[PDB]
Design a protein around this ligand. Structure first.
Ligand SMILES: *[C@@H]1O[C@H](CO)[C@@H](O[C@@H]2O[C@H](CO)[C@@H](O)[C@H](O)[C@H]2NC(C)=O)[C@H](O)[C@H]1NC(C)=O
Ligand SMILES: *[C@@H]1O[C@H](CO)[C@@H](O[C@@H]2O[C@H](CO)[C@@H](O)[C@H](O)[C@H]2NC(C)=O)[C@H](O)[C@H]1NC(C)=O
Ligand SMILES: *[C@@H]1O[C@H](CO)[C@@H](O[C@@H]2O[C@H](CO)[C@@H](O)[C@H](O)[C@H]2NC(C)=O)[C@H](O)[C@H]1NC(C)=O
Ligand SMILES: *[C@]1(*)O[C@H](CO)[C@@H](O[C@@H]2O[C@H](CO)[C@@H](O)[C@H](O)[C@H]2NC(C)=O)[C@H](O)[C@H]1NC(C)=O
Ligand SMILES: *[C@]1(*)O[C@H](CO)[C@@H](O[C@H]2O[C@H](CO)[C@@H](O)[C@H](O)[C@H]2NC(C)=O)[C@H](O)[C@H]1NC(C)=O
Ligand SMILES: *[C@@H]1O[C@H](CO)[C@@H](O)[C@H](O)[C@H]1NC(C)=O
Ligand SMILES: *[C@@H]1O[C@H](CO)[C@@H](O)[C@H](O)[C@H]1NC(C)=O
Ligand SMILES: *[C@@H]1O[C@H](CO)[C@@H](O)[C@H](O)[C@H]1NC(C)=O
Ligand SMILES: *[C@@H]1O[C@H](CO)[C@@H](O)[C@H](O)[C@H]1NC(C)=O
Ligand SMILES: *[C@H]1O[C@H](CO)[C@@H](O)[C@H](O)[C@H]1NC(C)=O
Ligand SMILES: *[C@H]1O[C@H](CO)[C@@H](O)[C@H](O)[C@H]1NC(C)=O
Lengths: 216, 274, 246
């Protein structure tokens, strides 16, 4: 970088004391903060194993103090198997680690399922000859737990000398006790919307003749 | 002394990131197993030379994907306290899921969504997609050669709507600006007195004794906390306006792509084909 | 019979396989117990809801034990440890601290309860389409062609049982888009022309069931000089033989 004869203290983007000249001499130096990152621990079930691997995030393995530097960081404590299996504990950028067979933590490249082609031809058709009726589940949340919080007790522990001060802050409490009440009413409306779609209650006859289909 | 304010923020942002991975995995990973087109191409006159992946290319992006990739300080932010984690599915994998969906859609029809991927000639399939919008099959074959040209030339124009016109990709480009808008507004907050006598902690630390520095430092901390919560809340809200966009894409990818949809003006404008 | 008829298979598939079909479904419910009898991660979504809400309160409650910059964390303490005129400055720091700790809890609920209003509205939609009728939105009610469903309650939620139809062994065969008899083309009324190599047949698209190409299940248009893939074959007619019977 070049400094005009009257320049130090290059902020150079927003407010950071970037490249700066020096006293005792005239040299245009530069400043960069030391390397930083957030460590993270990848571990299987505690009962299954006590061995853990460590993923230093976004740092060259040469400045860490059987490593394998990945696009996310510097994973230490895992063997890079070429093998490709389903993701178990996602790391990032296409690396997913798992506890496989002795027994240790490995890391590899994700496999987006298996592979096959299709026998596409100008005059060829495929027709199935059988069926498999199957049953699946999907499990949807509907409502939270209807709650509420009175302010002037949580904030001031029944101290009039505190309530006197609290009144000065305007209608903060009214807003909160209105919002939470709105939430609770919405929860009742929610639980009433999903189920109460039938106007009138039915019941099966005491005899059961559905054609072989047991609903016991 | 301020309690567990940090734990809350670092939990919320981590939740956001996990949700983003779940989002990107929901839209594309609807097919269990990767397909690929046969080396020979006999689809009845229909030329997909621009959407199918080009092997003579470093990545497996096709032409339109390359065009879209072309139509859209980076590190000063990193120094203060920020970072950016990389996505779980890299571009190569994402551009490979998509190839499977195009590969299946042309040789299987739709039956590769329900069960096992059946095989059907393309010219047969369009007969049973016309048959779903009230026109008989005889309309297709008696106009097959013309119809292919109408579609092949249609792809000809879709390049030019992207080749030079850049406002087509408005929605995504608007997303990136807003997020990068937040960080800069967040970063510049680090240079405000907030009522204190300076804006650098090392300054005020090396310019006053111990007993009198706390009162000044307090004004800075409460100021920066407020500047950080306000950034987190936007992300909590803004990321909830995209969870409602992926859920609208996952719905289209399961109806428009994996079959024929009759919801008027859902998949297109007019009677939908594929 | 009238729910098969909604996914492109005829009614005769059902009765001619009624006894088998019942067993396939009855045994299906047999396994769904075991997916819940011992496996506990099945009910992940609801159990994740309860933890988050109880996570907030504990984070909220422990905030009641922080100086926030004050000289203590109990009002009765500071009230019984300083005179009137000097207590207000200390108490102020506590109030502004606790207000901030309460708003931050409310805002989460305002947001989090808006991510569940978008879940009930997705359940009320399924309960009005999956349950109260048959839905053709692909991969909405199940994975495969949809047949019916069953609601089941659960603590703060709802559980469905999407019964579904899924094909099996697929056999490859030679096809042809049309058949030309006397110049005139011949298209299937509903089905695909198919051949084992020997003779030609027409079948529905989701269950192999060959039939003879009669003039009832076929309709004609134009001559066979413009379609591609046209094949030469006869078309049987049933209105001839009963005439010759005389
Ligand atoms: C379709 O699948 C069902 C279920 O697998 C078959 O029914 C069984 O067939 C085997 C012989 O392959 C018998 O031993 C069993 O007793 C049958 N009953 C069941 C429900 O297990 C049926 O045969 C298959 N049909 C076709 C066309 O392949
Ligand atoms: C499908 O379209 C592409 C163009 O998008 C055709 O590719 C070109 O063909 C001409 C004539 O052979 C060549 O001169 C060009 O170099 C080809 N490349 C491109 C990308 O322009 C392709 O031949 C068409 N295929 C079919 C089946 O018609
Ligand atoms: C169906 O049969 C007709 C009658 O045999 C075929 O028409 C003949 O076509 C060949 C050339 O392929 C000519 O050399 C003959 O003179 C034609 N005979 C006529 C006009 O009666 C027709 O090609 C056959 N089509 C198929 C699909 O096999
Ligand atoms: C509906 O299915 C249940 C569960 O399979 C059946 O319950 C069994 O009933 C028999 C007596 O018939 C008992 O001996 C079993 O212990 C019960 N449970 C088990 C473990 O199978 C119920 O009978 C079925 N209903 C019909 C009419 O078949
Ligand atoms: C190809 O198709 C023909 C269809 O006719 C099969 O021949 C059968 O024809 C009759 C039933 O339509 C019956 O006589 C037999 O089931 C059967 N065999 C005879 C004697 O023609 C034929 O099996 C099929 N398979 C081949 C040989 O490709
Ligand atoms: C000025 O600084 C230089 C470098 O430290 C030194 O060599 C020189 O003697 C100094 N001159 C003085 C003492 O003014
Ligand atoms: C880490 O540092 C070494 C030595 O400077 C260098 O060769 C390497 O490219 C750096 N990064 C990686 C990818 O390890
Ligand atoms: C199908 O096969 C090839 C094209 O791949 C060609 O001979 C012709 O289009 C078709 N032939 C038959 C057997 O119908
Ligand atoms: C159809 O062909 C494919 C590819 O050769 C094969 O895997 C499949 O088993 C065949 N189906 C049958 C049994 O006809
Ligand atoms: C390990 O497995 C046991 C038995 O299933 C279970 O009780 C325990 O919670 C598990 N602990 C983990 C996953 O760390
Ligand atoms: C497999 O071989 C590759 C080199 O081709 C190596 O990078 C990788 O670590 C090996 N993994 C093992 C030990 O299975």
């Amino acid at each position: 970088k070049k400094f005009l004869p009257f320049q130090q203290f290059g902020r150079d983007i927003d407010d950071t004391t970037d490249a700066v000249r020096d006293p005792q001499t005239l040299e245009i130096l530069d400043i960069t903060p030391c390397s930083f990152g957030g460590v993270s621990v990848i571990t299987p079930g505690t009962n299954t194993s006590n061995q853990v691997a460590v993923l230093y995030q976004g740092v060259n393995c040469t400045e860490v103090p059987n490593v394998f530097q990945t696009r996310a960081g510097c994973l230490i404590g895992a063997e890079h198997v070429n093998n490709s299996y389903e993701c178990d504990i996602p790391i990032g950028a296409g690396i997913c680690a798992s506890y496989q067979t002795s027994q240790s933590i490995i890391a590899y490249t994700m496999s987006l399922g298996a592979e096959n082609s299709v026998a596409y031809s100008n005059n060829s058709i495929a027709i199935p000859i059988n069926f498999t009726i199957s049953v699946t589940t999907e499990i949807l949340p509907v409502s939270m737990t209807k709650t509420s919080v009175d302010c002037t007790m949580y904030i001031c522990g029944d101290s009039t000398e505190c309530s006197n001060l609290l009144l000065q802050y305007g209608s903060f409490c009214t807003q909160l006790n209105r919002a939470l009440t709105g939430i609770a009413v919405e929860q009742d409306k929610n639980t009433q919307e999903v189920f109460a779609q039938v106007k009138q209650i039915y019941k099966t006859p005491p005899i059961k003749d559905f054609g072989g289909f047991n609903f016991s | 002394q301020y309690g567990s304010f940090c734990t809350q923020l670092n939990r919320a942002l981590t939740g956001i990131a996990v949700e983003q991975d779940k989002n990107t995995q929901e839209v594309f990973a609807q097919v269990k197993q990767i397909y690929k087109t046969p080396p020979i191409k006999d689809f009845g006159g229909f030329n997909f030379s621009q959407i199918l992946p080009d092997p003579s290319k470093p990545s497996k992006r096709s032409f339109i994907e390359d065009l879209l990739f072309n139509k859209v300080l980076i590190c000063a932010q990193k120094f203060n306290g920020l970072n950016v984690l990389p996505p779980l599915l890299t571009d190569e994998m994402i551009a490979q899921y998509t190839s499977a969906l195009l590969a299946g859609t042309i040789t299987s029809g739709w039956t590769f969504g329900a069960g096992a991927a059946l095989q059907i000639p393309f010219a047969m399939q369009m007969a049973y997609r016309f048959n779903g919008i009230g026109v008989t099959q005889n309309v297709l074959y008696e106009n097959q050669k013309l119809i292919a040209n109408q579609f092949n030339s249609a792809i000809g124009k879709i390049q030019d709507s992207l080749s030079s016109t850049a406002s087509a990709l408005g929605k995504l480009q608007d997303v990136v600006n807003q997020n990068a808008q937040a960080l800069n507004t967040l970063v510049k907050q680090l240079s405000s007195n907030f009522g204190a006598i300076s804006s650098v902690l090392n300054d005020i630390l090396a310019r006053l004794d111990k007993v009198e520095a706390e009162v000044q430092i307090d004004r800075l901390i409460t100021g920066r906390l407020q500047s950080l919560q306000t950034y987190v809340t936007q992300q909590l809200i803004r990321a909830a306006e995209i969870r409602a966009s992926a859920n609208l894409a996952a719905t289209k990818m399961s109806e428009c792509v994996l079959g024929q949809s009759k919801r008027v003006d859902f998949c297109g404008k007019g009677y939908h084909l594929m | 019979a009238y729910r098969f008829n909604g996914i492109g298979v005829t009614q005769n598939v059902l009765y001619e396989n009624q006894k088998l079909i019942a067993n396939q479904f009855n045994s299906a419910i047999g396994k769904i117990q075991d997916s819940l009898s011992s496996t506990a991660s099945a009910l992940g979504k609801l159990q994740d809801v309860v933890n988050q809400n109880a996570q907030a309160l504990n984070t909220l409650v422990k905030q009641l034990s922080s100086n926030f910059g004050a000289i203590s964390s109990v009002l009765n303490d500071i009230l019984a440890r300083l005179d009137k005129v000097e207590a207000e400055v200390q108490i102020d720091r506590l109030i502004t601290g606790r207000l901030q700790s309460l708003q931050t809890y409310v805002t989460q609920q305002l947001i989090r309860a808006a991510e569940i209003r978008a879940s009930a509205n997705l359940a009320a939609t399924k309960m009005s389409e999956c349950v109260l009728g048959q839905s053709k939105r692909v991969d909405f009610c199940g994975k495969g062609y949809h047949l019916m469903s069953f609601p089941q309650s659960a603590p703060h939620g709802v559980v469905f049982l999407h019964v579904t139809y899924v094909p099996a062994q697929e056999k490859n065969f030679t096809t042809a888009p049309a058949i030309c008899h006397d110049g005139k083309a011949h298209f299937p009324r509903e089905g695909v022309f198919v051949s084992n190599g020997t003779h030609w047949f027409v079948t529905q698209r989701n269950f192999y069931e060959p039939q003879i190409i009669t003039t009832h299940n076929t309709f004609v248009s134009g001559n066979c000089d413009v379609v591609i893939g046209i094949v030469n074959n006869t078309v049987y007619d049933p209105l001839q033989p009963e005439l010759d019977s005389f």
